[PDB]
């Protein structure tokens, strides 16, 4: 997140860190004790065998005994278009079930077909690049955002912050867009650059796939 604020300690207990070596590379969202939702390109050319699904985290710069690391069992995709960046959603099955603590909780999704219009206030998060200076975020980061329809596709849900150069950057892909306590977006791609101020940041449109998510999660 560029131009954002630190999150309160585990204020968003559904926030997941997808790690490869020991470094963060994508974020995710816990939608069930044994399921994780993220971005399809986050696993496109990676050995999913080696990805550890870190959950219940705050500062990924050292070890937290409240953190619960998992591995990927099953990978579901509903037609990811790697070139057009369409349907950039993936459901990752867990290895096991997570302890629903105060630090780990199950996020919730909207209904199939729910479209947010321009003007709706949303919130983005991620451990991605920390902003202008300073790289990957050591501490989860927050950012108030508003939905835009201009310079966007309904094959996405788009987000702009008006009056400042701020928005999602590299490493935030797969992280959720919370709108009224509902997960409406998955961080897919930016245009021209992260906090460009002219091109809207694009999220994967969760509401278009819920019926598909419910067939895996139920």
């Amino acid at each position: 997140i560029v131009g954002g604020r630190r999150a309160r300690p585990h204020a968003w207990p559904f926030m997941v860190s997808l790690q490869l070596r020991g470094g963060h590379f994508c974020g995710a969202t816990l939608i069930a004790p044994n399921f994780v939702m993220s971005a399809a390109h986050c696993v496109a050319n990676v050995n999913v065998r080696a990805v550890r699904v870190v959950l219940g985290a705050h500062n990924l710069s050292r070890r937290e005994p409240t953190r619960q690391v998992f591995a990927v069992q099953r990978i579901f995709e509903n037609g990811y278009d790697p070139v057009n960046l369409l349907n950039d959603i993936v459901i990752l099955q867990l290895n096991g079930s997570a302890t629903i603590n105060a630090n780990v909780q199950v996020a919730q999704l909207p209904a199939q077909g729910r479209r947010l219009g321009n003007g709706v206030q949303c919130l983005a998060m991620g451990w991605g690049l920390l902003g202008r200076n300073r790289g990957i975020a050591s501490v989860l980061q927050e950012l108030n955002v508003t939905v835009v329809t201009s310079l966007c596709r309904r094959s996405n849900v788009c987000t702009l912050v008006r009056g400042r150069q701020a928005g999602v950057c590299f490493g935030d892909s797969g992280s959720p867009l919370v709108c009224n306590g509902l997960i409406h977006g998955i961080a897919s791609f930016v245009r021209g650059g992260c906090a460009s101020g002219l091109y809207p940041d694009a999220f994967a449109p969760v509401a278009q796939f819920v019926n598909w998510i419910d067939s895996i999660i139920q």
Partner: peptide
Amino acid sequence: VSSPVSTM
């Protein structure tokens, strides 16, 4: 690629 897309 920028205006084509810049997947993070």
